[PDB]
Amino acid sequence: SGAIYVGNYRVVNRHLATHNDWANLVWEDSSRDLLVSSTTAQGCDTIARCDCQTGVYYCSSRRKHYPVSFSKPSLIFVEASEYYPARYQSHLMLAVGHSEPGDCGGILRCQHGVVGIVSTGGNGLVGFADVRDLLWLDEE
Numbered sequence: 001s002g003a004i005y006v007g008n009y010r011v012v013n014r015h016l017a018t019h020n021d022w023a024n025l026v027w028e029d030s031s032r033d034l035l036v037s038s039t040t041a042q043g044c045d046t047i048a049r050c051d052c053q054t055g056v057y058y059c060s061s062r063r064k065h066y067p068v069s070f071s072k073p074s075l076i077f078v079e080a081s082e083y084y085p086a087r088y089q090s091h092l093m094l095a096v097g098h099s100e101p102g103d104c105g106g107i108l109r110c111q112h113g114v115v116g117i118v119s120t121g122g123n124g125l126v127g128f129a130d131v132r133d134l135l136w137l138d139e140e
Ligand SMILES: NC(=O)[C@H]1CCCN(C(=O)Cc2ccccc2CS(N)(=O)=O)C1
Pocket: 015, 033, 078, 080, 081, 082, 083, 084, 089, 099, 100, 101, 119, 120, 121, 122, 123
């Protein structure tokens, strides 16, 4: 579990969104596993605006923050699960690391801020849904 809180926005994994989120929907993309909903109180997270490929992510299944190297956002085939059939997920970045289903929502950060959130796992890899291209998160 986990979310990013930037301004009046709440960014979560789409497969984990709640009732409150869909009723107050700003934007969602099934192919990216992302959903953004509006909030009453202001958030304090800063979104990174960079091309960093090294950062640190939180892994709830180990209670540890791990430093990682990660690939650039791309279209990656993701196996069928209880949330989606087998499909290509866009804007996904992979790293070598530990990730179990309950790890989705863990933040990946670099020196410039939040890069993304855990979205995929298994086979000794962890995938992060990139948020650095969503420039509108910084305004309105
Ligand atoms: N973004 C997605 O499509 C993810 C949605 C949640 C499920 N996805 C994962 O990668 C989670 C995962 C982590 C470790 C091993 C195995 C899995 C797949 S599952 N079916 O067992 O949950 C895929």
